[PDB]
Copies of this chain bind each other. A is one copy, B any other.
Amino acid sequence: LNEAMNVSCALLSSGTGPRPISCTTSTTWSRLQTQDVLMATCVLENSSSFSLDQGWTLCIQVLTSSCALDLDSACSAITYTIPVDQLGPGARREVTLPLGPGENGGLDLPVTV
């Protein structure tokens, strides 16, 4: 818990550029069967010493085009979770989760992860 307290103070306070923990998200184009699909590498980095012990998890959420359409959409959003296990200093792990065309180039674009 003390490691968690130090980490939480690090993230929330110190209103500077470099935080100890970060998650940079890129986009990429990869080929599956014949299609091209978009991918999001979300790369989590631990630049500090605090070493996220256990009972930390990583909750990515991928929100489509944002508006209050009357009927609803079949998938308002998607969520993925991953338990982070050790993640000591300087380490990093990487998660490719797609955004790709929904069934007929079906990709409205602002899309926020």
Q: Is the CB of B30 within 8 A of A97?
A: no
- Give the oligomeric copy count: 2
Q: Which of A1-9, A11-19, A31-39, A46-54 contacts B (4 or more CB under 8 A)?
A: A31-39
Contacts of A39 in B (CB 8 A): 31
| Closest B residue, CB atoms, query A30 | B30
Contact of A33 among B30, B32, B34, B97 (CB under 8 A): B97
Tell me the complex Cα distance, A39–B33, Å.
10
Q: Is the CB of B34 within 8 A of A95?
A: yes
| Closest B residue, CB atoms, query A94 | B31
User: Residue A65 at the B interface, CB < 8 A?
Assistant: no
Flag A80-92 by CB within 8 Å of B: 1 or 0 each: 1010000000000
Flag A17-47 by CB within 8 Å of B: 1 or 0 each: 0000000000000111110000101000000
User: Residue A76 at the B interface, CB < 8 A?
Assistant: no
Listed from nearest, the 5 A-B pairs whose CB atoms lie closest are A31-B96, A33-B97, A32-B96, A33-B96, A30-B30
